[model samples]
Target: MRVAIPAEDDRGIKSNVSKHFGRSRYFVFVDIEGEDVKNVEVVEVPFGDLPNFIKDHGAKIVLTYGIGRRAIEYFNSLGISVVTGVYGRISDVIKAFIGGKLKIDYDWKE
Candidate 1:
């Protein structure tokens, strides 16, 4: 399983990202059965191609601050989950997600 977070820049895995899905550069922190895993570097395509980019990666979920309605519906149709309204250190966010203790989120298409 994998969860992708949009980091602010190159030094992302250790920092709190800007969290805007449409424009952020994504640093995917993938997991192996709920444990912390490797970080995969990714650059977001233009906003117009975001859905195709996400679907092509086969990601199960994305942790971000916001996304537009059209973008949300496209990804949702492809079975990719989006978690929005997030802000914090990247690793800690993963931890919170695994522990089910974080609630920072918004539904674009669910």
Candidate 2:
């Protein structure tokens, strides 16, 4: 499975999580086999180019904060699962997701 987080830069998982989806500077794509991280790739793209960005990297799940109903639904329509209203570093969020501890505390799309 693949998961992605909007990040400050392409510095692997250690990059800080961006506050908003459309304003993120980069997206970090992490590939997981079972519960282990199998590969990590960073795609450098402005938020405007995210559709094409995810088209190439293609993460099934996304963890972030403050996305509009349209973007959330758009991802869902593309079969991408999103868990929003998340905070903290990108790495910890991934760990929490893997451990089943990350909570999807808010969903404006709801």
- Weakest ten-residue segment in model 1 by summed lDDT: 39-48
Per-residue CA lDDT of candidate 1, range 1-110, in tens? 77777777656557675656777665654553655565555554452476667666667787876767777778788888877777778767877877878767555335
Model 2 lDDT per residue over 44-99, tens place? 77522564467557688887776767887888778888787887777788888888
Native-referenced Cα lDDT, model 1:
0.68
Which parts of model 1 have CA positions greater than 4 angstroms off? 36-48, 103-110
What are the root-mean-square deviations of the candidates from the true structure over C-alphas? 3.7, 2.7
> What does the lDDT read for residue 6 in candidate 2?
87
Candidate 2 backbone collisions, by pair: none
Model 2: weakest 10-residue lDDT segment is: 46-55
**lDDT to native, each model:** 0.68, 0.77
